[PDB]
Every structure is written in C-alpha cells, then in structure tokens.
Design a protein around this ligand. Structure first.
Ligand SMILES: Cc1[nH]c2ccccc2c1CC(=O)N[C@@H](Cc1ccccc1)C(=O)N(C)c1ccccc1
Ligand SMILES: Cc1[nH]c2ccccc2c1CC(=O)N[C@@H](Cc1ccccc1)C(=O)N(C)c1ccccc1
Ligand SMILES: Cc1[nH]c2ccccc2c1CC(=O)N[C@@H](Cc1ccccc1)C(=O)N(C)c1ccccc1
Ligand SMILES: Cc1[nH]c2ccccc2c1CC(=O)N[C@@H](Cc1ccccc1)C(=O)N(C)c1ccccc1
Ligand SMILES: Cc1[nH]c2ccccc2c1CC(=O)N[C@@H](Cc1ccccc1)C(=O)N(C)c1ccccc1
Ligand SMILES: Cc1[nH]c2ccccc2c1CC(=O)N[C@@H](Cc1ccccc1)C(=O)N(C)c1ccccc1
Ligand SMILES: [Cl-]
Ligand SMILES: [Cl-]
Ligand SMILES: [Cl-]
Ligand SMILES: [Cl-]
Ligand SMILES: [Cl-]
Ligand SMILES: [Cl-]
Ligand SMILES: [Cl-]
Ligand SMILES: [Cl-]
Ligand SMILES: [Cl-]
Ligand SMILES: [Cl-]
Ligand SMILES: [Cl-]
Ligand SMILES: [Cl-]
Lengths: 213, 213, 213, 213, 213, 213
C-alpha cells in the first residue's frame, strides 16, 4: 500500500482464505475493502490474481473495469505534450487499472499536491464489479422470501435481510421492499399481530411482538 | 483507526471469529469495543459489514443508529454558510454514521482543536444497539433463575449473574435484584443457611457458607 | 495500554483463551498480569468483560474492588475546589476502577509529574480479588496432601507445592508448612530415609534421596 | 528486502506453504511476486531454495535465468577499469542472479542515483521462468474446453478462463480465443441462445442469458 | 524486557507451550534464554509463574536462587547511608530475584553508567537451577549407553550425545567420555572397524565407516 | 540479531518446526540462513541449541566448527598487548563460535569501522557443517538414479535433480553429471527420442519431448 510499502503476507493470506470459505457472499466485499485500504493498483491486481478458481467472475470483473476505464478516458482525454520537469502526466484508464503504468507512476499520482488517487479510483471500479457478481451469484429474489408456517419470525427476518443485502436496487427501492414485503410475506398468525401495530412500528417492536408466536 | 491507519487483518479476523463462535453474548461487546479503539465511522461500518448472517440484528442496529442520528440532528441543527479556509463543517447524523461523509472529513473532525470525536460518538450509538440485541437475544429472565435441589450454589450464582448481565435494567434495579432475588430463589437447605448471616454478608461469605451443601 | 494505545487483538485473544483452558488456576494470574503491563482501568475492565461464564467469580471480584475503592476513599478524601488550568483532580475509588473517569482522565493521572498510577493501583485490587477466587476454587487443603504407598516422591512433591501455591497464607506460614508437612506426610519407607538427613537438607537432596524408592 | 532488512519468517513460511498446496498453479506467481516486493537477489534465491521437491521445474528455471543473464551480458558488456572511490561497478548476469555478487554489492546498486534495480530485474527473469513452468505443467489446451450437455454455463466459463489463464499466448491471441472459442464450444441449447445476442454482448449478459439453461 | 517494554503475548505463549510439550529437556533452556533476552527480574518471574504443574522443579529452582542470592549478599554487603539525589542503591539478592525491588528500581540498575545488569545476573541463577533440574530429570547415565547388536551406528550416536548433553560434568570430563566411552561401548562388529582408524579419527569418518554395518 | 535485538519467538519457533518436519533436507539450509540474517554467534548458537534429537549431526557440526576455528587461528594469530581505549581486540576461533566472547564483544566487532563480521563468519562455518550432514544423510547417489520403464520423464527429472542437489561435488562436476547422466540413464524409449535432439537441447525441450511418452 502507500506510505511504497509491500502488502503484508497476512493481508494476502487473509484475502485468499476469505474467498475460499465465503465465495462471493456480500461480506467478502467489505473484507476486500478493509484489506486494501491505501492500496495501489498493482496491490489491488495482486490481490485479484491470488484468487484461483472463480475465473468467470474475474472475467466479468475485468469487463466492468474496461467499461469504467473507457468512461474515464472519455471524460478525461489525454493531451499531447512533454511532461515538464517537476511534474506528472495525466493517467488513462489503463494506468488506473495498473496495466500501462509503473509502481512509481502510481506512487507519483497518489503522493502529490493535489493527489490524484488512482488507488481509490480503481478500487471504486473493482467494488463496482464485485457487487454485480455478488448480485449475480445470489440464487434467490427478495420477492420469493416467505415465512414458513412454523418458522420463528427472527429466522424469516434473517433470510429477508440477507437476500435484501444482495439485491440489485437503490435505497429508495430497498426502503420500499422493507416497507411492503416484510409484513406482506409473514405467515397469517404473525401477519395479523403486526398489522395491529401499524406501519409506524420498529423492527425491535415487530420482532418482540411475534416473539412467542 | 486514527493516527489514518488501516485496520489490521487480525483485528478484522478477530471480530469475524468472535461473532461466529459467540453470536450475541454479552462479552462480544467489550470485544467489539476493544477491537475498535480509535476507529473511524468507516472502520466501524467495515467491522459491521464483515458479519454475514445475523441480519435481523444488523437491521435493528441500523434503526437504533438512525434514531440516534435524528436525535443528534435535533440538538445540533446545521447552519447555512461557506466553510471558511482553515476550518471544518458541522457533522450531521449521517456524517457520524459514515454514510454522507468521507474518510478525510472523518479524519478532519477527529484531529482538531477542539476534537469532534465522531469515532467515539458513533461508537456510542453502535454499542447502544448491540445491548438492545444482546438483551433481546437473551432467552431467559432473572426472575426465572432458581437453584435446583441438588445444584451446587456456585453453579446457581454463575447462572444468576450471567442472566443478570444481559438484563434490561439500570444499576439501582440490578442492586435490587441482587439484594432480593439471589437469596430468595436459593433452595430451602442453603436458603436457611444464608438467612442466618443476614443481609450484610459478602458473596464470598455466602459462597463459602453454602459450599459443602 | 499507556504510551494511549489500543490493546492488541492477540493480547485480548490470549486472555480469553487462558481462562477457557485453565479457569482459575494460579498461573492464570501471572498471565493476567503479563498481558496487562501498562494497562489503563478501561483496558483492565475490557479484559475482565471479555470473559463469559465464571460470573460468580467476577461478582466476588467486583465486591473486592468495591471494598478496596471504599478503603482508598477513606484514606484519600476528595476536597471541593475548581481544578485549576494546567492541573488534574484527585481520583476516587470509582475513577480508579474506571466507572466514573474517562480515558483522558486516566491518561491524565498516569502521565504527569508526579505520576498517579491508577493503572497499577487498580491492577493491585484486581489481582487481590483473583487470589481470593483462586484460593476459593482450589478444591483441596495442604493438610490433606499425603504420599501414597507406591507414589514416586517427585509426584507427591508436585502435588504438595501445587496445593501450597493456592493456599491462603503468608510466607512465614508457608515456610512452616514446608518445614513441617512435607516430611511429616511422606510414606513410611521414604519418611525414614529423609529423617536420616535431618532438617538441613535441600529439596534437591531430598528428591534425589527418595529417588529409587 | 531493501530498506537491508531480513526477510520475515512468515513471508518465508507463506512462500513454502503456497507451493505445497498449489504447486504451479497460475495464482502462485502473483503470490510469489507479492511476497518478494523489494527483494534482493539473495532474498529471491533464498525463496527459491526453500522449495523442496519440484526440482525439474527449478532446473528449467535456472536455464531460463542463464539465458536471460547471457542476454543481459550481450547488451551490457563490462568495461575494464578501476572502480573509482564513491562509485559502483557494472553488474553482470551472474551478479543479477546473485551468484557473483555480495549483499552489499546488491544493496549498492539498488540504492543509488540512478538506481540500478537488480532486485526488480532478476525478479523479471524469475517470473518469466515461472510462467513457462506454469504453462508447461498445465495439462489441457483451450481448444479442448467444451461445455457438457448438462453443464451449467457458469462452470464451463470457469474452466474456459482457467485454462486460458495458463495458455502460452499474447493478448491479441487471447482476445481472439475469447471471441471465437467461448461461443463456438458451448452446447447446442445455449449456443443457440447466445448467437441470438450477437458478438457485441457482455459476459454478464451471456452468463445471465444461459443462466436457467 | 528493557528499552521498559511489556513482554509480548507470543513470547509468553511460546514459553508456556515449550514446557507443555518438552518438559525439562535440555533444549528448553536455550529456548528459555532466547525468549528472555533483555528481560527484567519481574519479566523472568512472570515467565516462571506462568508454568503450571512441575512445581517440585520450581521449588528446587527457588532454593537454588536463594543460595545464589545469599552468595551475592556475602560478596556484596549493603552499606547504611542515604541514597543521594541522582544516584541508585546497591541491590540485594532479593532485589535481584525481584522480591524486594520495584520495576523502576530494576529499570534503574540496568540503565545507568555503569550498568548493574540485574536481568542478566538473575538470569544466570535461573539457568543454573534449570540445568540441575534437567540433569536430575534425565533418566539415564552416559555409562549405560550401549550400541545394540543390530542398531545403526547413527542411532547409537544420537543416544550417546543426547544423554551426554544432559550429564553433570565439566568440559574436560565430557571430552573424556567422548574419547573413552563412544568407541568402548560400540557393538563388536563396528567396535573392530573403528579401532582400525585409531583415536585421531573424526566423528564424520567414524559414522561413515560404520555406515553400512 | 544486530541493530542488539532479541531474536523473535516466531523466528525461533520457525527454526524448530523446520527441523522436526524436514530433518536435514537440503532446503532446511536456506531456511536456516534466512532465519539467521544479521544474527550474532550467540543467536546462531541459540538456534542450534533449540534442536533436540539429531545430536550426532550436531556433534559433527561442532567438529567442523572446531576445525574452522583452528584454521582461523592459524591465519590470524593473536598478538599480546593492552587493548587501547577506543579500540577492540582481535577475535579467536572460540570468540567467533561464541564460546569465549560476550554479547558486547560480538556487538563490538560487528559494528565498527571496519566491521569484523563474526556473525557472517561463523555463519559460514555453520552452513559448511550443515552441507556435510545433508550430504551424509542423503541415502542415494546420483549414479543410482535411473528412469523406470513406465516412469513419467518429469518424475525422473525430479528425482535426478533432488539427489543432485545433495551431492558432494563442485559445479564443474555437477555440470558434467547433468551433461552425462541425465540422458544416459533415461529408459530406452525416451533415451532414443532425446538423442535425436542432440546435446544442445534445453531441459524445457527435453521435458516437452518425452512428455507424451
Ligand atoms: C449488512 C447490510 N444488509 C443490508 C441490506 C440492505 C441494504 C444494505 C445492507 C447492508 C450494508 C450496510 O448498510 N452497511 C452499513 C454498515 C452497517 C452494517 C450493519 C449494521 C449497521 C450498519 C453501511 O455500510 N453504512 C454506510 C451505513 C451506516 C449506518 C447506517 C446505514 C448505512
Ligand atoms: C461481567 C458483568 N456481569 C454483570 C452483571 C450485571 C451488571 C453488569 C455486569 C458485568 C459488566 C461489568 O460490570 N463490568 C465491569 C468490569 C468488571 C468485570 C468483571 C469483574 C470486575 C469488573 C465494568 O465494566 N466496570 C466499569 C466496572 C468496574 C469496576 C466495578 C464495577 C463496574
Ligand atoms: C509457582 C509458585 N509456587 C508457590 C508455592 C508457594 C508459594 C508461592 C508459590 C509460587 C509463586 C512464586 O513464588 N513465584 C516466584 C517466581 C518463581 C516461580 C517459580 C520458580 C522460581 C521463581 C515469585 O513470584 N517471586 C517474586 C520470587 C522470586 C524468587 C524467589 C522467590 C519468589
Ligand atoms: C486471473 C486471470 N485470468 C486470465 C486469463 C487470461 C489472461 C490473463 C488472465 C488473468 C490475469 C490478469 O489479467 N490479471 C489482471 C488483474 C485482475 C485479475 C482478476 C480480475 C480483474 C483484474 C492484471 O494483472 N492486470 C494487469 C489487469 C488489470 C486490469 C485489467 C486487465 C488486466
Ligand atoms: C547440543 C549439545 N549437546 C551437547 C553434548 C555435550 C555437551 C554440550 C552439548 C550441547 C550444547 C552446546 O555445546 N551448544 C553449543 C552450540 C552448538 C549446538 C549444536 C551444534 C553446534 C553448536 C554452544 O552453546 N556453544 C557455546 C558452542 C559453540 C561452538 C562450539 C562449541 C560450543
Ligand atoms: C535447488 C537446487 N538444486 C540443485 C541441484 C544441483 C546444484 C544446486 C542446486 C540447487 C541450489 C541452487 O542452485 N540455488 C540457486 C537459487 C535457485 C534455486 C532454484 C531455482 C533457481 C535458482 C542459487 O542459490 N543460486 C546462487 C543461483 C542463482 C541463479 C542461478 C544459479 C544459482
Ligand atoms: Cl497473473
Ligand atoms: Cl483484457
Ligand atoms: Cl456492504
Ligand atoms: Cl438505512
Ligand atoms: Cl460489559
Ligand atoms: Cl457494582
Ligand atoms: Cl541451497
Ligand atoms: Cl547453473
Ligand atoms: Cl504467582
Ligand atoms: Cl521462598
Ligand atoms: Cl545448551
Ligand atoms: Cl567442544
């Protein structure tokens, strides 16, 4: 990461083990982001290359990065000119993704006034592609989450918000799913109980209300 | 945490493993607090996102945070004005919870004269919500803790104060439960023995007194 | 601990694992003390809260701390007055135990000329309470330790000094137990052998003497 | 690595364990490169010597290094002359590979104005030889990767790009394999589906399209 | 250890695990010494207290320390006088063993011109007592080590020098045991072979000579 | 190692575990050398003492060191004279091996203008003795390595160069063994194939040539 310092063996080992155990579960992404705080594109690519298997996902992730790189290039067209002494060039999508830049060039951009934070830019595009993959490898839809007739409310809520966490939707949409589906898809016994509090009640209140039942 | 330094792989790994093994047992909270000393809201959210499962709890925790955020906003209304050079804006609940602020904005508030410690503020609200969840996921009530007819006193006391640690109550109330229930719910044999010391006796004295019996 | 630095994940993890494996065996206490070198009351309380189970002991430990706190208060009565700029208040038992002081207040006392070392003071009271608990949870008495008729001397000596380490007694008393009981409670065969050296002989000499027998 | 600092026990241990578990799988190479950031030729050779077994590969790796060393020597012929005070000699292939230079000589070249980065040069030649070995120890060819009649598309894509990652080919060639083979070798059912999007469709679109089938 | 720095959790954990696995095997002592480089008497005592079991040995170790303490006191008698400002007292055996001195007093002696290295002095006395215990808990004598009629020479030599390492003897004596016993106690077949080289032959030569046989 | 800094618990633990698992396999030596970068003779001896078992080897290693020490003494005879203030004595073989010098004396020699690097000198003599032992404990000879009639070429090459790595021979000799034996000892089927490339062919070419067969 940036200081340039080498990425620690236990950081790398942690990243590897995460993916083995959990595959593309939503929580892998914060872990990824945690493990890569202050990382350079080289460090980010290293991290992605140390994954074996899951190559279809890694390929999708590539394309997503290429798309983001091409978008960057459009907004930031590179001018012809000799980079003057005591000064650094403008980066291109490929430099951000680490394919056409060096470690020093990456070091150069990130430590400067102003900083051109290619680490945090590329990191944006990578997390972007990880969400698509999580979203894609999630098997079920939030509309299919229903409470079984004997299922403790708490377990339904765990399944509801787990499936929700992986959904393709903005916040306004997710608020709406919470507001509509949660109560809608409860089993009749508890569905009754909850309606009897109305739509101003907290999840604490709802969980404690259908607790016994 | 704050120095900004990345949160260590073993910190993160420790937090993950805690929750797998112990779920929402009261001792997870000091561990949480320990693992997050000097943490920024970004670091705190990272920690909370690396939990898979337990999403109903995480949702309740969200609401609790929103409530605390809205309370903060009431007491601290944000004024319109250009933030002047060499100066930093007033935070809003959403900035404290990390949703509408950057890492630098968080760094900005925490390192300053005076410090505006959004790390320790948000941490307050998170622990708050963890207590509610611990409290909620605790199965039994302190009123149900009774000594079995053959149960070594020491084992009853362990169950008493374990259930007590998870109770919804203030200190005055807990003193009262200790003072009333402990001796009240002992089995007849030992209940006799203890009454014969009176209400000035130490737990050491009480445990050593019903030791053989 | 003090530098304020956060307490390390492996310190915390070490403390947790100690108590799981060994419970309240005498050696847990040096470990505790080792793991808490330079710790603040907050750090000490953290460490104590990360223990689940064993709550009867933790309760006794509380009372012991309250007793020590009340004793401190007697010897150190707090005066009314405005704490003047460039100066720090006098601590009360509750501040030492971490319940009515902040991290900075604790930092304040410990780093100063002179230092008011609330870390090492509270640590005193905690170890105090741990000894009582070790002492209490020790099953046997040193008077009950006798050498079996076929028991290798070395194994008797291991049981003797293990039970001894956990006894409620001062040094003068322990010298006396060593001097009297060790030789007194040996089996007849070896009891003879040892008497034949007298009371000036080293444990090395005694162990090597009853070695074959 | 360079600061000279000793290479960490966990770095070394990590490198050893990598090769035991994964042999010469493509992902071992980024791991190698990660574990050796800032390494000297001595450190690089150490790392290679701590591998037991796999000696045929290590021998091929040697030859590759000798070839690269001899190529370096051709482009950089060494001049006769006394190395003047406050100055450092020109390196030869053998000095780069660590066989005819010292630690200080390596330290000398790497820290200087300009730097002569024998660490990153030799590292180039080593990774070069690792690719040949990965390439060689890869059992299958990309032309043999076909989708089974019941095989979920996602699993075919994983096998396609895994075999692809290990192929001997430049980027232009790999683009061509992706463009031609992937769709060509799909099973008839899904082959139809995909043709019906054409050759402008993303892997996301293709995977989600043959998802159900 | 000394800088005062707290002793690391993994140092402590390492020391504990050593004794569990290996008991009092000669190699535990270098490990002890390794783990305690730069340690204060407090740190040394901590290390010794974290051992459970083996208390007979710990008791012998105590006595040995008391003997060394009393010897120190004889050679270094303490003078009456007020320790003057900017100056430090003379230590007594009990101060060296950590029983009548503080951490600062220990810090005081060790960092000074001249240094009074109570860490390395007490460490001397501890290793002293560990040797006696190793020596004592070693079951066999070097005179009993004989080569079996089918026993590979190499295995006899391993048993010879293992038993030798644990013997009570000075270097002159050990040279003599090597010189006399090794060849003396070999089985007739190989005993012949070796005599036929004479007493100027290396262990390499001797091992390679009785290799096949 | 040198800064004097204590040798890390994980360094020591790593060294111990290496020898347990791998005994005296050639790769243990680079590991040894890696783990001991910048080590003092005291640190080197510590490392060697933490090995239990394998004492015949450790004894041979001693003799080898004594031989190297006596050779040093011959080339470097010690002069009589008072070591003058601001100056350090000339070392003797025994000082290099750590038996007649202190930690400071070792520190003294290694940090100086010029440096007298007793760490790297003694390390030379130790690795020297480790090679002899590896060489000796290697069971087979390179002349005995033949390809089985069904044995994949790659597996023969692994056995060839593994046995080769442990051989007593200089580089000129090893080049010759490679050049002569490898092709000579192949099975008839593949022996034919290879002869048909001649003696200018790379191991890559040879391995890929007998690949199918
Ligand atoms: C874990 C989770 N489940 C979801 C379901 C639907 C939509 C999103 C999610 C998330 C991610 C998720 O929302 N994580 C939270 C952090 C968090 C996690 C767990 C408890 C409390 C706070 C987050 O990243 N931020 C920025 C946040 C912070 C406070 C309030 C709201 C959001
Ligand atoms: C562990 C526990 N059990 C309880 C039951 C009822 C109410 C609270 C609890 C607690 C938490 C609990 O009280 N923890 C203690 C620390 C502690 C833990 C264990 C032993 C001694 C000190 C604490 O956080 N503080 C601030 C404290 C310190 C000294 C005295 C009183 C309180
Ligand atoms: C381990 C142990 N067993 C006992 C039995 C009765 C009374 C006390 C104990 C102890 C604790 C015990 O005495 N530990 C020793 C350290 C120690 C441990 C083991 C061997 C040598 C030195 C200690 O803390 N100190 C201050 C000490 C140091 C030197 C001499 C005497 C005491
Ligand atoms: C993992 C992999 N599979 C391949 C198949 C064919 C050819 C090459 C490969 C690779 C290595 C591979 O291409 N790794 C990527 C890093 C990477 C890995 C995984 C996902 C996203 C980015 C890489 O090293 N660089 C420089 C890169 C970065 C962005 C876009 C394109 C290339
Ligand atoms: C391991 C061992 N076995 C013995 C048998 C009899 C007497 C002593 C021992 C020892 C301890 C032993 O002698 N250890 C050696 C270190 C060592 C260990 C192993 C191989 C080479 C060097 C040691 O501490 N020193 C000071 C030493 C160094 C060089 C030559 C001679 C002695
Ligand atoms: C591993 C090994 N097998 C051998 C067989 C015969 C003779 C020696 C050996 C060795 C040790 C061996 O030669 N190790 C190599 C490092 C190395 C290891 C593995 C692959 C590439 C480079 C080494 O130490 N050096 C100095 C070296 C570096 C480049 C070229 C030639 C030698
Ligand atoms: Cl790669
Ligand atoms: Cl690409
Ligand atoms: Cl998230
Ligand atoms: Cl929300
Ligand atoms: Cl708590
Ligand atoms: Cl209380
Ligand atoms: Cl080697
Ligand atoms: Cl070579
Ligand atoms: Cl103790
Ligand atoms: Cl004593
Ligand atoms: Cl030793
Ligand atoms: Cl010797």
């Amino acid at each position: 990461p940036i200081v340039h310092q080498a990425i620690s063996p236990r950081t790398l080992n942690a990243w590897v083990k995460v993916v083995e155990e959990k595959a593309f579960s939503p929580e892998v992404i914060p872990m990824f982001s945690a493990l890569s705080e202050g990382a350079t594109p080289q460090d980010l690519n290293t991290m992605l290359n140390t994954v074996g298997g899951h190559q279809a996902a890694m390929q999708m992730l590539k394309e997503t990065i290429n798309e983001e790189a091409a978008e960057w290039d459009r907004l930031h067209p590179v001018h012809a000119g000799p980079i003057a002494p005591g000064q650094m060039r403008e980066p291109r999508g490929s430099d951000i993704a680490g394919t056409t830049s060096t470690l020093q060039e990456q070091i150069g951009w990130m430590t400067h006034n102003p900083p051109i934070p290619v680490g945090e830019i590329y990191k944006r595009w990578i997390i972007l592609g990880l969400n698509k993959i999580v979203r894609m490898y999630s098997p079920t839809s939030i509309l299919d989450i229903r409470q079984g007739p004997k299922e403790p409310f708490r377990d339904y809520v765990d399944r509801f918000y787990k499936t929700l966490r992986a959904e393709q939707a903005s916040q306004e949409v997710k608020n709406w799913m919470t507001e509509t589906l949660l109560v809608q898809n409860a089993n009749p016994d508890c569905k009754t109980i909850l309606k009897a509090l109305g739509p101003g009640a907290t999840l604490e209140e709802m969980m404690t209300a259908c607790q016994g039942v």
